[PDB]
Design an enzyme around this catalytic site. Structure first.
Site, PDB file in Angstrom:
ATOM      1  N   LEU C  40       0.767  -1.096  -0.071  1.00 58.04           N
ATOM      2  CA  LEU C  40      -0.127  -0.040   0.043  1.00 58.04           C
ATOM      3  C   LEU C  40       1.021   1.308  -0.216  1.00 58.04           C
ATOM      4  O   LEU C  40       1.494   1.728   1.040  1.00 58.04           O
ATOM      5  CB  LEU C  40      -0.906   0.056   1.057  1.00 58.04           C
ATOM      6  CG  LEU C  40      -2.170  -0.893   0.918  1.00 58.04           C
ATOM      7  CD1 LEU C  40      -1.884  -2.235   1.723  1.00 58.04           C
ATOM      8  CD2 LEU C  40      -3.337   0.027   1.587  1.00 58.04           C
ATOM      9  N   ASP C  41       0.895   1.927  -1.241  1.00 54.36           N
ATOM     10  CA  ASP C  41       1.863   2.906  -1.451  1.00 54.36           C
ATOM     11  C   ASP C  41       1.703   4.125  -0.788  1.00 54.36           C
ATOM     12  O   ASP C  41       0.707   4.490   0.080  1.00 54.36           O
ATOM     13  CB  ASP C  41       2.141   3.104  -3.039  1.00 54.36           C
ATOM     14  CG  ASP C  41       3.707   3.277  -3.350  1.00 54.36           C
ATOM     15  OD1 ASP C  41       4.190   4.398  -2.445  1.00 54.36           O
ATOM     16  OD2 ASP C  41       4.245   2.869  -4.233  1.00 54.36           O
ATOM     17  N   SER C  42       2.427   5.201  -1.360  1.00 52.27           N
ATOM     18  CA  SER C  42       2.168   6.719  -0.599  1.00 52.27           C
ATOM     19  C   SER C  42       0.708   7.011  -0.563  1.00 52.27           C
ATOM     20  O   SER C  42       0.158   7.574   0.424  1.00 52.27           O
ATOM     21  CB  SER C  42       3.039   7.613  -1.267  1.00 52.27           C
ATOM     22  OG  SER C  42       3.194   7.383  -2.324  1.00 52.27           O
TER      23      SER C  42
END
Ligand SMILES: CCCCCCCCCCCCCCCCCC(=O)OC[C@H](COP(=O)([O-])OCC[N+](C)(C)C)OC(=O)CCCCCCCCCCCCCCCCC
Ligand SMILES: CCCCCCCCCCCCCCCCCC(=O)OC[C@H](COP(=O)(O)OCCN)OC(=O)CCCCCCCCCCCCCCCCC
Ligand SMILES: CCCCCCCCCCC[C@H](O)CC(=O)SCCNC(=O)CCNC(=O)[C@H](O)C(C)(C)COP(=O)(O)O
Ligand SMILES: CCCCCCCCCCCCCC(=O)O
Lengths: 172, 64, 86, 122, 459, 71, 303, 182, 124, 128, 173
Positions: C40-42
């Site tokens: 789950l990225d930025s």
């Protein structure tokens, strides 16, 4: 430095739902909205040449600013809130410890003894922390507001005193 | 007793030295203390003369 | 306000990650770094930052809000922000 | 209010303007103007310290109201009866003033029809 | 009246022959003693002044000034204790001599019975202050500071001298009593209006007047700490005390041509107060606020209403004190930081709480909060002005807009707020600063309870 | 502190409302319900407008002294 | 803030006029712009409190709306009716801030309405205190509102007054009845909106004591002194019934209009921003200019 | 005559007593918040005694206990307008203050300046109820700024906040605009 | 960008955009967060003009012109519409206050030594 | 569409609203490095002297005393009597004065038109 | 009563006679009874202490009187000896005249409050008597300024004097 799409739309998404939670108040409504802006935010994470990527971004900010909650919620302890800079009145520097009266110095002897060795490690490690910092400093001074560590042996991380001796966030 | 000493020297002594102040020194000076005459009312007697301030005449007899 | 401790305040946040249905309860770790150790990225992180902030009270500054990304490096900051030695 | 609506929205010649009223003598259509009288004389209210704005024709029950209230203490809950017969002259005086407003009004209506019938015939 | 004059004259052998260590200990211990001796002059009759001798006399107007000057003299002594400790002993004795000689000329000036005797001792005071301002000053411009001081004051002083001798040759005496009893109406001839111009512009210059005020910002700011208080506290007020004295023969032309001055004070008082709120130097604030209050008393004398003369005396002493604590306080931040910028030092109560307590009560004293004699004197000016013109209130009411707009403004940026974490120079408060603070402000609340003596001769 | 907090709270449950603050809350609520409806019938005339107002069309010119349009 | 800026020193200014009552009302014209100054406050201040994301602004505005009413009574030659108004004014407005501050202490330093819910069950006594305090102010018979708010509304209604001087009072009283329930809703009605760390409490007896010592005021108030004080008011007795009940009328639609808008915050839907919501929250954008425009120009001239 | 004035004049006196103990520092820190709480509480309970005089007798009376000076035809004196407006405002006012400052000490409990705060509330009543008792308009003005400059200090309870200092500026400014007409 | 040079006295000093001290980043590690200053960096000529306590130059959600329109549009309505009510007030259809003893003029301040014509009334 | 915000002297246009700050360009990206470096050294020469135990005095800011000299001293050495300066001085100096003169001279004589043939009220004015 | 009614007239004392037809014990009366016994009596004995100790020595003061001097009217022009006395005499009369309007003001002040709302007619003579005091006070002193003088007072008195003297001649017609 300069801001790029990732830094900026992360900035966008912070404020955007801060307005939304303040708009909806009750959790569940804003809950359905916040998670659907998420899909609305990834509904276009494949755009072509950066000009459109910037242009759609321009459309994001304008609707954000007029979609910005005119009276948004701000946590008091953070800038803009009730408790912002509230305890700075109780904030007091550490050098007032030095000019303590000798009769009062003997009423807090252990705490003044500990400050003696704390200022001791301030002095015996100040000159080594700074000389190492200048030699490892690239020419033209620092190129950014960074700080080198105590990377070597038997040293303190340069420019540590004030930030180690920063007054507590609740000086009370 | 905490209330008692609070009375004697933060209430009871204070009322003493003001009581001594007005009626013995301020009222010793004329017109310092002024007093509106009480709303004397028919049927009453003034303490000295006892004159019954003119007794109220009859009413136009309103009742509900 | 109690004598807030890092141990208590992090166990609050490890709940948020295990309350993150996306962040599986088995996927919980004190070093669950969202974009590469979790995925789950930025974008899938900044909303969690507000989620913890909404439940923490403090607002972590934006320069490190997007940056402090591994649960221990976040809980390092509430240790800094509250400035408690426990 | 009906009087306010008729005066502004309708016609003010048929509606008593609060400052201009009364515009007709009390004997016009209502003879035997036998001057009414209240009871507790001007010394009485003076000796009652009565408020100037309240020294009205209902002054009689006023001072006797404050008579028993002067002895009603300690109990404040007393003298309800003599309280509201004073309201009865204030009732009577109010409707009398209400009577005054409409008496001019009914004269104001009649005045319109009067001049309409005694000036338009020719 | 040589009860006070001679012991001050003798004070020069005293300090000069004192030992190395005492000197200042000697200087204070006897200057306080002279102060209660001068406190005797509080004995006034109803209206007949205290005529001590042929050349010396005092009244209900002069006496509050005498006590102000005589009791002031110890204060700059202790105030100068810190600033001038490093200097050798001989100049130390010389500096005290300048202070004593200054107070010496002040007390005779306020108490002269002949106009020219007042004049000779009126401008005799710039000679020591020129020494004080120029020699013992701190910043470079102090050189030009003295030039601005004397030349401004003298530029009006000489016309007064020519006018004074003219009255001597015309009436036969310049003595206050004779000129008051034989006062004659000053006609409206062009010769007489210039005579009025001659006998007024001298005091107007060191009043000051709007436009004729540059010396105080260029002098008080760069004057030595002791010198700075003395200028604003009393050396402002020779023109005032003279003004109510010479205004006994200038009638009726005063009521006819005081309008340009009443103009320039009223707009100036708002103008000076507004610019006072917009300086980066705190010392300029007390200077600019001083004239703002000082511009008020010129209004008082111009209308010459009894009520106006009431507050002229009270505000004179009130402001004369008021500038004193602020200059004392503004000094205390300076040597600690070696700068007079309010921006550099903010929120000092987090480091100096007791100093802050003194700072705020001096500030609210400047606010003219009743029952303090600052307001009641200042208020009487308002009432006299309303009697002169009902409209007057708005322009001066604008002065009750700017004063507190700045008079609490440095508080919230000098004593109130947060502290910059870089100044470790700030230390505890030496008891001298608070002690002189005590003798500075405690009086003003004391005679507040009893305002009649400092009210003035119009009682 | 350590030697206190008799309202000892916990995480994400009801803040252990002791019965006191509850039956206190219902006490003065009952008291002020009692107080204001007790007079809602004891002296309801005080709020109900004890004395009535007459509509002015319900009057006659004889008792009002206006002569009809004949004179 | 509860001590000074609720009803204790703000009323000093209006109390000054009622002190000057022997000469305050002598000039009929001088009365007129009092009704003018008072009326615009009530419209403006109550408008501001119609939307306020706090628990302090609404009380302050409903005060300034009230301070825009006592001098209305002297504007219609009613000194004592103004005078009793301030007495009850302090009786309930002290509490509204008192309980509000209790929320700020119980729930850690929070003031905005949109950060806390379920305060009924978790905060019973403060809920009861807030209920009666709003109940006291919103004109209710046999409390502060009866002898004061009911009395003033009826008094300005039948006395000689400008139409708009009347009009604001009924509108503002409706608005006082309006946003009083708006904060009651956001206080208690709604699921908890506070951080998971549960710390809300009032078990401190001294806080509980202080509330009940003023509770007797907030429900009894004028009745303890109603017949005790002599009648300085000239009564009207009979008068038409429609505007006498307007105070009780204006309360009811003040309620459910807030209720339905409270249910819009219950209703799952995106409520669009509008000028009216912002207009109330930023005081009609008044401090946005007055605290910015005139002071910038004058002091720049000072530069 | 014998009662009434002397009782309420004591009320003005008795809660000034906490202040000049505070300057003399006879208070032992935490005792002062409760100490002033007590004095204000009796200041209430004594204030009803003049009140009870008004319900029965209804009389009012003006006291001139001191004369400041005589400006020819104007003799400024310490005159108190003590009347129904004055006497009944007393008990409601400070009982409300007594009620709130209890909620204050529970709320305001961590900042080590409890005493400095509590005295700041104490002198606040002193300036208030002298306005409602004042007879000469000058005395009313004395209390008029007295609350005004003290609201500035009280709202500026925390110098860390610059908005507080900002808030005091317009608070004094708008108050100053009012007293121009005064 | 130095200040415009026309009898202005600023000379070397550069034009500083209207950025108040409240407007600057409150999250930055300012050396002097009092007005959000740092060390050594240039300072505005009118710095004290725009500091956090004093006037601020910060963005607002909605245009300054809009305030101008509502603020003018809002306030202008009453004194206009309140001017209308100055001709049209509201009252109750109730007659005047007929009063005994020549309408208080005996005891309403007015001197009764001069002939105080008795204005008396009757219950109609 | 929707209401549109506008820049102002105090209600300045936000960076978020202005698309100019969004115009990513090599000149701006390369420019930011210099400000980053100069602020870095300023932070460096702030911290070392501040954190130095030997620095018992006050660390002055060169920008601070440049401003103080500028705001007071540099005016007249750089002042030039342009026509607009005379006009502004006229309308802020002698100009406002004549405003007070005309208004104050008028009512004063207007009062003097009242007293002489007795049309002014002096029933209580005995404290002249 | 160290004063006297001839200079300080006050209204007579008329008090009502309460008839407590009620049953509740009157708290007001009990508050007085405890007040005189607990508060008055101890301080009274202290007051009775200060009486006879003041009586064991009573030094007397006497009034300060001044012989009336020749006025400025008979004071020779530009003379300085007898100008002194007449200028002194006038200024004492100035201070005297302030204290009598003060006395009428104090009489005025007491008249209203002690007579309640009835003061509107109870001070009618009290109101009227001030006007003749004030208007004559203005004729004595008005527009004299801070530097008032006996010569300037006579100049004003003269200025009014021929104006009315000429008006009286004009009024003869
Ligand atoms: C007896 C005395 C009168 C008769 C004898 C004298 C007769 C000649 C008078 C004029 C002499 C020459 C003037 C020279 C001059 O003005 O130079 C330009 C002068 C000097 O300019 P400057 O050289 O200072 O200009 C540079 C300024 N700085 C340093 C800041 C860069 O101009 C000015 O001073 C400004 C314009 C004139 C301002 C004064 C006019 C009004 C006077 C008001 C007070 C009146 C009393
Ligand atoms: C008899 C009745 C007379 C008329 C009464 C009118 C007011 C009725 C009560 C209104 C209560 C409003 C309310 O609930 O306010 C709080 C609420 C908070 O809304 P929130 O949950 O934050 O979501 C929207 C914002 N994003 O706010 C909202 O949701 C917005 C509600 C807007 C209410 C505006 C009130 C203005 C009334 C006076 C207008 C005067 C105009 C001149
Ligand atoms: C109240 C609500 C207001 C608001 C709603 C209502 C108003 C605004 C409506 C329009 C909103 C707009 O479509 C989206 C916006 O907010 S902004 C732009 C997002 N698109 C990009 O920037 C393209 C490039 N893409 C990336 O930079 C990465 O993909 C990213 C960082 C996003 C994820 O990276 P990943 O996490 O590694
Ligand atoms: C149910 C609503 C009833 C409304 C009645 C009218 C309210 C406005 C006031 C009318 C009475 C006073 C003015 C007229 O008369």
């Amino acid at each position: 430095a300069y801001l790029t799409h990732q830094q900026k739309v992360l900035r966008l998404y912070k404020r955007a739902l801060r307005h939304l939670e303040s708009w909806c108040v009750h959790r569940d409504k804003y809950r359905y909205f916040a998670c659907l802006m998420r899909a609305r935010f990834d509904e276009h994470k494949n755009e072509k040449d950066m000009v459109k990527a910037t242009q759609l971004l321009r459309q994001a900010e304008e609707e954000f600013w007029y979609g910005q909650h005119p009276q948004p919620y701000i946590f008091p302890e953070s800038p803009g809130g009730t408790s912002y800079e509230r305890y700075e009145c109780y904030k007091v520097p550490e050098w007032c410890l030095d000019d303590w009266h000798p009769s009062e110095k003997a009423m807090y002897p252990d705490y003044f003894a500990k400050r003696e060795q704390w200022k001791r490690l301030r002095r015996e490690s100040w000159e080594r922390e700074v000389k190492q910092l200048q030699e490892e400093t690239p020419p033209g001074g620092p190129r950014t507001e960074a700080l080198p560590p105590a990377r070597k042996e038997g040293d303190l991380p340069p420019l540590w005193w004030h930030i180690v001796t920063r007054p507590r966030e609740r000086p009370m | 007793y905490r209330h008692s000493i609070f009375a004697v020297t933060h209430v009871l002594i204070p009322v003493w030295i003001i009581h001594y102040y007005l009626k013995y020194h301020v009222t010793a000076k004329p017109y310092t203390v002024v007093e509106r005459k009480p709303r004397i009312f028919p049927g009453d007697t003034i303490l000295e003369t006892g004159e019954v301030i003119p007794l109220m005449k009859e009413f136009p007899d309103q009742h509900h | 306000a109690p004598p807030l401790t890092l141990e208590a305040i992090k166990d609050r946040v490890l709940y948020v990650l295990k309350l993150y249905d996306k962040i599986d309860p088995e996927k919980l770790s004190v070093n669950s770094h969202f974009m590469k150790d979790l995925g789950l990225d930025s974008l899938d992180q900044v909303e969690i930052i507000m989620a913890m902030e909404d439940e923490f009270g403090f607002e972590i500054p934006d320069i490190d809000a997007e940056k402090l990304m591994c649960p221990q490096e976040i809980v390092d900051y509430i240790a800094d922000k509250k400035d408690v030695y426990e | 209010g009906a009087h306010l609506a008729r005066r502004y929205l309708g016609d003010a010649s048929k509606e008593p303007d609060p400052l201009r009223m009364p515009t007709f003598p009390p004997d016009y259509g209502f003879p035997e103007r036998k001057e009414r009288e209240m009871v507790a004389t001007q010394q009485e209210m003076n000796d009652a310290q009565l408020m100037l704005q309240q020294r009205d024709y209902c002054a009689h029950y006023l001072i006797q109201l404050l008579k028993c209230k002067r002895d009603s203490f300690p109990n404040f809950l007393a003298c309800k009866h003599e309280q509201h017969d004073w309201d009865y002259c204030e009732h009577l005086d109010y409707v009398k003033r209400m009577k005054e407003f409409e008496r001019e009004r009914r004269l104001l209506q009649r005045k319109k029809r009067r001049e309409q019938r005694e000036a338009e015939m020719a | 009246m040589l009860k006070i004059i001679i012991p001050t004259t003798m004070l020069l052998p005293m300090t000069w022959m004192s030992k190395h260590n005492m000197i200042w200990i000697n200087a204070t211990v006897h200057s306080l003693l002279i102060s209660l001796i001068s406190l005797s002059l509080l004995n006034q009759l109803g209206e007949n002044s205290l005529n001590f001798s042929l050349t010396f006399f005092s009244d209900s107007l002069s006496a509050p000034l005498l006590v102000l000057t005589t009791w002031l003299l110890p204060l700059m002594l202790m105030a100068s204790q810190s600033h001038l400790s490093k200097e050798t002993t001989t100049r130390k004795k010389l500096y005290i001599t300048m202070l004593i000689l200054l107070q010496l000329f002040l007390i005779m000036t306020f108490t002269a019975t002949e106009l020219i005797l007042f004049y000779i001792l009126f401008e005799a005071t710039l000679v020591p202050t020129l020494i004080i301002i120029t020699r013992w000053g701190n910043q470079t411009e102090r050189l030009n500071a003295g030039l601005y001081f004397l030349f401004y004051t003298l530029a009006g002083s000489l016309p007064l001298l020519v006018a004074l001798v003219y009255i001597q040759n015309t009436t036969g005496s310049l003595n206050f009593l004779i000129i008051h009893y034989w006062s004659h109406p000053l006609s409206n001839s062009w010769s007489n209006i210039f005579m009025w111009l001659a006998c007024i512009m001298a005091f107007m210059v060191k009043m000051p007047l709007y436009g004729l005020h540059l010396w105080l910002p260029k002098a008080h700011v760069e004057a030595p700490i002791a010198g700075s208080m003395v200028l604003a506290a009393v050396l402002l007020k020779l023109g005032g005390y003279g003004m109510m004295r010479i205004t006994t023969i200038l009638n009726p032309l005063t009521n006819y041509m005081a309008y340009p001055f009443l103009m320039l004070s009223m707009w100036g008082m708002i103008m000076t107060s507004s610019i006072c709120l917009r300086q980066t130097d705190l010392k300029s604030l007390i200077a600019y606020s001083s004239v703002s209050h000082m511009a008020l008393v010129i209004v008082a004398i111009m209308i010459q209403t009894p009520w106006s003369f009431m507050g002229a005396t009270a505000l004179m002493i009130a402001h004369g004190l008021t500038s004193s604590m602020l200059f004392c306080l503004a000094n205390t931040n300076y040597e600690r930081v070696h700068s007079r910028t309010m921006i550099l030092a903010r929120g000092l109560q987090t480091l100096l709480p007791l100093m802050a307590t003194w700072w705020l009560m001096a500030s609210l004293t400047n606010l003219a909060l009743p029952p303090s004699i600052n307001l009641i004197g200042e208020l009487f000016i308002i009432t006299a002005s309303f009697s002169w013109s009902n409209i007057t209130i708005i322009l001066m009411g604008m002065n009750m807009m700017i004063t507190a707009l700045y008079s609490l403004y440095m508080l919230i940026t000098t004593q109130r707020g947060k502290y910059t974490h870089h100044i470790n120079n700030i230390k505890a408060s030496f008891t001298r600063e608070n002690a002189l603070m005590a003798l500075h402000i405690l009086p003003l609340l004391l005679l507040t309870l009893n305002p009649k003596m400092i009210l003035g001769p119009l009682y | 502190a350590g030697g206190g907090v008799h309202i000892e709270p916990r995480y994400r449950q009801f803040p252990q409302l002791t019965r006191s603050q509850l039956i206190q809350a219902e006490f003065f609520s009952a008291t002020m319900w009692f107080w204001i409806l007790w007079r809602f019938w004891h002296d309801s005339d005080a709020v109900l407008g004890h004395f009535p107002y007459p509509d002015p069309s319900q009057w006659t010119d004889e008792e009002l002294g206006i002569l009809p349009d004949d004179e | 803030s509860a001590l000074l800026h609720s009803s204790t020193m703000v009323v000093a200014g209006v109390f000054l006029l009622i002190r000057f009552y022997p000469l305050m009302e002598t000039n009929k014209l001088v009365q007129t712009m009092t009704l003018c100054l008072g009326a615009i406050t009530t419209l403006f201040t109550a408008l501001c409190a119609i939307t306020q994301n706090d628990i302090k602004k609404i009380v302050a505005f409903s005060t300034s709306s009230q301070l825009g009413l006592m001098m209305v009574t002297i504007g219609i030659n009613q000194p004592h009716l103004a005078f009793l108004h301030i007495c009850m004014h302090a009786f309930f407005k002290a509490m509204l801030f008192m309980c509000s501050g209790s929320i700020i202490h119980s729930l850690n330093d929070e003031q905005d309405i949109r950060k806390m819910g379920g305060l009924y069950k978790a905060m019973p006594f403060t809920t009861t205190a807030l209920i009666i305090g709003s109940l006291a102010l919103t004109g209710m018979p046999y409390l502060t509102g009866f002898y004061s708010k009911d009395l003033i509304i009826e008094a300005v209604n039948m006395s000689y007054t400008n139409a708009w001087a009347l009009l604001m009072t009924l509108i503002a009283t409706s608005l006082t009845a309006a946003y009083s329930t708006r904060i009651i809703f956001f206080a208690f009605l709604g699921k908890p909106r506070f951080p998971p760390l549960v710390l809300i409490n009032e078990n401190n007896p001294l806080l509980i004591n202080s509330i009940k010592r003023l509770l007797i005021g907030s429900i009894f108030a004028g009745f303890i002194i109603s017949n005790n004080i002599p009648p300085m008011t000239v009564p009207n007795t009979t008068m038409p019934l429609y505007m006498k009940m307007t105070a009780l009328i204006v309360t009811i639609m003040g309620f459910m209009l807030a209720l339905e808008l409270n249910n819009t915050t219950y209703y799952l839907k995106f409520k669009y921003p509008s000028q009216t919501y912002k207009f109330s929250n930023m005081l009609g954008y008044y401090p946005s200019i007055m605290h910015r425009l005139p002071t910038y120009h004058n002091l720049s001239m000072s530069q | 005559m014998n009662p009434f004035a002397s009782l309420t004049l004591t009320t003005l006196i008795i809660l000034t007593i906490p202040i000049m103990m505070s300057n003399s520092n006879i208070y032992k820190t935490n005792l002062y918040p409760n100490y002033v709480k007590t004095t204000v509480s009796y200041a209430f309970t004594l204030s009803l005694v003049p009140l009870l005089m008004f319900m029965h007798t209804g009389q009012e009376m003006i006291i001139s206990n001191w004369h400041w000076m005589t400006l020819q035809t104007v003799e400024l004196s310490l005159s108190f307008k003590m009347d129904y407006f004055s006497v009944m405002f007393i008990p409601v006012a400070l009982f409300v203050t007594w009620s709130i400052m209890e909620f204050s000490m529970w709320y305001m409990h961590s900042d080590p300046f409890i005493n400095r705060f509590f005295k700041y509330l104490v002198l606040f009543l002193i300036t208030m109820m002298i306005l409602v008792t004042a007879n000469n308009l000058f005395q009313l003005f004395i209390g008029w700024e007295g609350v005004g400059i003290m609201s500035f200090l009280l709202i500026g309870w925390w110098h860390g906040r610059t908005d507080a200092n900002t808030a005091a500026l317009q608070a004094i400014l708008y108050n100053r605009i009012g007293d121009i007409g005064f | 960008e130095p200040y415009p040079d026309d009898g202005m006295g600023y000379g070397d000093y550069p034009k500083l955009p209207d950025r108040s001290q409240q407007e600057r980043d409150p999250w930055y590690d300012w050396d002097h967060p009092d007005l959000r200053l740092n060390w050594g960096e240039p300072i505005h000529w009118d710095l004290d003009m725009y500091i956090r306590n004093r006037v601020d130059t910060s963005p607002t959600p909605v245009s300054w012109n809009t305030m101008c329109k509502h603020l003018s549009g809002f306030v202008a309505f009453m004194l206009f519409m309140f001017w209308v009510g100055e001709i049209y007030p509201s009252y109750q259809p109730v007659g005047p206050k007929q009063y005994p003893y020549n309408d208080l003029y005996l005891e309403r301040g007015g001197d009764p030594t001069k002939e105080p014509e008795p204005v008396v009334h009757y219950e109609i | 569409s929707f209401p549109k915000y506008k820049p102002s002297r105090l209600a300045t246009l936000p960076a978020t609203l202005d698309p100019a700050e969004y115009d990513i360009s090599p000149e701006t990206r390369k420019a930011q490095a210099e400000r980053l470096a100069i602020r870095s050294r300023l932070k460096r020469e702030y911290l070392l002297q501040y954190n130095d135990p030997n620095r018992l005095g006050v660390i002055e800011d060169p920008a601070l005393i440049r401003w103080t000299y500028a705001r007071s001293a540099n005016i007249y050495p750089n002042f030039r009597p342009t026509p607009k300066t005379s006009l502004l001085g006229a309308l802020f100096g002698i100009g406002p004065l004549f405003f007070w003169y005309y208004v104050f001279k008028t009512d004063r004589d207007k009062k003097e038109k009242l007293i002489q043939e007795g049309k002014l009220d002096q029933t209580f004015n005995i404290s002249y | 009563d160290s004063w006297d009614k001839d200079v300080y007239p006050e209204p007579p004392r008329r008090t009502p006679a309460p008839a407590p037809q009620t049953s509740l014990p009157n708290p007001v009366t009990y508050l007085t009874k405890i007040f005189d016994l607990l508060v008055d009596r101890p301080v009274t004995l202290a007051r009775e202490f200060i009486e006879q100790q003041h009586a064991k020595n009573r030094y007397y003061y006497y009034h300060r009187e001044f012989r009336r001097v020749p006025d400025i009217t008979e004071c020779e022009e530009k003379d300085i000896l007898c100008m002194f006395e007449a200028e002194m005499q006038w200024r004492r009369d100035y201070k005297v005249d302030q204290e009598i309007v003060n006395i009428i003001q104090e009489r005025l002040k007491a008249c209203q409050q002690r007579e309640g709302e009835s003061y509107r007619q109870n001070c009618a003579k009290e109101l009227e008597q001030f006007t003749q005091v004030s208007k004559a006070f203005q004729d004595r002193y008005s527009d004299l300024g801070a530097h008032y003088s006996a010569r300037k007072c006579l100049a004003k008195q003269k200025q009014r004097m021929l104006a009315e003297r000429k008006a009286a001649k004009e009024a003869a017609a």
